[PDB]
Design an enzyme around this catalytic site. Structure first.
Site, short mmCIF file in Angstrom:
data_model
loop_
_atom_site.label_atom_id
_atom_site.label_comp_id
_atom_site.label_asym_id
_atom_site.label_seq_id
_atom_site.Cartn_x
_atom_site.Cartn_y
_atom_site.Cartn_z
N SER A 41 4.23 2.14 7.93
CA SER A 41 3.95 1.02 7.06
C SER A 41 5.27 0.40 6.37
CB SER A 41 2.98 1.31 5.81
OG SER A 41 1.99 1.54 6.59
N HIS B 156 0.71 -1.36 0.04
CA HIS B 156 0.21 -0.09 -0.06
C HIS B 156 0.94 1.29 0.19
CE1 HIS B 156 0.27 0.35 4.67
NE2 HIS B 156 0.32 1.88 4.24
N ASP C 36 -0.73 -7.39 1.84
CA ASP C 36 0.01 -5.88 1.71
C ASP C 36 1.41 -6.13 1.95
OD1 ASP C 36 0.34 -3.46 1.79
OD2 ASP C 36 -0.21 -3.08 3.70
C1 LIG Z 1 0.67 2.97 4.98
C2 LIG Z 1 0.67 2.70 6.53
O1 LIG Z 1 1.85 3.66 7.09
C3 LIG Z 1 -0.41 2.52 7.61
C4 LIG Z 1 0.10 2.11 8.86
C5 LIG Z 1 -0.83 2.24 9.90
C6 LIG Z 1 -0.60 1.53 11.13
N1 LIG Z 1 -1.57 1.69 12.16
C7 LIG Z 1 -1.48 1.34 13.34
N2 LIG Z 1 -2.15 1.81 14.47
N3 LIG Z 1 -0.73 0.27 13.63
N4 LIG Z 1 -1.61 2.01 6.81
C8 LIG Z 1 -2.64 2.51 6.55
O2 LIG Z 1 -2.67 3.88 6.61
C9 LIG Z 1 -3.88 1.68 5.81
C10 LIG Z 1 -3.53 2.04 4.00
C11 LIG Z 1 -5.18 2.25 3.63
C12 LIG Z 1 -5.90 2.78 4.97
N5 LIG Z 1 -5.13 2.20 6.11
C13 LIG Z 1 -5.41 2.04 7.23
O3 LIG Z 1 -4.54 1.73 8.21
C14 LIG Z 1 -6.74 2.65 7.80
N6 LIG Z 1 -6.48 3.28 9.27
C15 LIG Z 1 -7.86 1.23 8.39
C16 LIG Z 1 -7.95 0.48 7.03
C17 LIG Z 1 -8.50 0.99 6.02
C18 LIG Z 1 -8.89 0.27 4.76
C19 LIG Z 1 -8.65 -0.97 4.66
C20 LIG Z 1 -7.68 -1.42 5.65
C21 LIG Z 1 -7.29 -0.60 6.88
#
Ligand SMILES: *C[C@@](*)(O)[C@H](CCCNC(N)=[NH2+])NC(=O)[C@@H]1CCCN1C(=O)[C@H](N)Cc1ccccc1
Ligand SMILES: *[C@@H]1O[C@H](CO)[C@@H](O)[C@H](O)[C@H]1NC(C)=O
Lengths: 253, 36
Positions: free
Chosen positions: A199, A43, A99
């Protein structure tokens, strides 16, 4: 990272920074699995709902870093990407299932005290360590808090793996076999989590048999950061190992 | 490079190779109902 600590120098030598060419910006974490291959979250390259679709040309990778923003002269190596490979069945549409992505470096990186690859688990290592209650370590240059920010140095947090069922019941998002969740339960009175900007970074464990560090997960998603009753989700690396093996063996390490 | 990666994989030049420990790695090993 929320509720972590500054990493020590050379603590995570496999840690890579995914960096945007222009505007120059910290896209995500990544980890070095050899002198030519990097592993990240898909992602970080492709997320159509946000108009996100990065090509080899758009990015650079930075290895051996500590500082979030300084250019670490005589320490850090910057590389260009030969090729990006996204899991063909990565599900950006509903839940970030699979992912994961591999990046091929334009030229191999030389190892050093601050640069060195992590191991990929084999079925047994995976079997012994991937247990509820067992702790792993996560690292990254992401958000310090859910919303307010950026740390000055690489942050680290040790979190326990949680029981698949408690994982399921914490969210309305459809959890698959290619994911695991991690964090402290609310009574447990102890926090920490990954967060946005984290991520692609590694969830690693140290084997008690041979003392080596293995990457068991990739930081994937969550809802908010460090909220009670909630947990972080990670791409389950052993499960996606065949794919991994497969691309490396066609596209040649 | 993949499976348990390279060959020297997962052994840190400034900690494992010197037989030095990082400040919190103990907490991990103790959770594997105390390491090695
Ligand atoms: C891309 C990354 O930095 C990130 C990591 C976030 C980690 N969060 C925690 N508390 N450990 N991921 C994201 O932001 C992903 C990508 C798209 C949306 N997303 C989310 O995490 C949303 N908050 C929740 C979600 C939305 C849609 C599908 C899956 C999860
Ligand atoms: C991402 O961009 C590439 C061209 O760079 C295109 O081939 C691919 O189809 C795009 N992905 C979509 C929006 O899924």
């Amino acid at each position: 990272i929320v509720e972590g600590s500054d990493a020590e120098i050379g603590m995570s030598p496999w840690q890579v920074m995914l960096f945007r060419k222009s505007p120059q910006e910290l896209l995500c974490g990544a980890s070095l699995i050899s002198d030519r291959w990097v592993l990240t979250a898909a992602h970080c390259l492709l997320y159509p709902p946000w108009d996100k679709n990065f090509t080899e040309n758009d990015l650079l990778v930075r290895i051996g870093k500590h500082s979030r923003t300084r250019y670490e002269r005589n320490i850090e190596k910057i590389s260009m990407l030969e090729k990006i490979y996204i899991h063909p069945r990565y599900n950006w549409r509903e839940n970030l299932d699979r992912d994961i992505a591999l990046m091929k470096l334009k030229k191999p990186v030389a190892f050093s005290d601050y640069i060195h690859p992590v191991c990929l688990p084999d079925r047994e290592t995976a079997a012994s360590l991937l247990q509820a209650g067992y702790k792993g370590r996560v690292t990254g240059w992401g958000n310090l808090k859910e919303t307010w920010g950026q740390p000055s140095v690489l942050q680290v947090v040790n979190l326990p793996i949680v029981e698949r069922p408690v994982c399921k019941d914490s969210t309305r998002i459809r959890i698959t076999d290619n994911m695991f969740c991690a964090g402290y339960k609310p009574d447990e009175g102890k926090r920490g989590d990954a967060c946005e900007g984290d991520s692609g970074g590694p969830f690693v464990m140290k084997s008690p048999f041979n003392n080596r560090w293995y990457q068991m997960g990739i930081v994937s998603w969550g809802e908010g950061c460090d909220r009670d009753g909630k947990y972080g989700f990670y791409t389950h690396v052993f499960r996606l190992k065949k794919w991994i093996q497969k691309v490396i063996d066609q596209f040649g390490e | 490079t993949f499976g348990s990666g390279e060959a020297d994989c997962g052994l840190r030049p400034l900690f494992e190779k010197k037989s030095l420990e990082d400040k919190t790695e103990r907490e991990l090993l103790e959770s594997y109902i105390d390491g090695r």
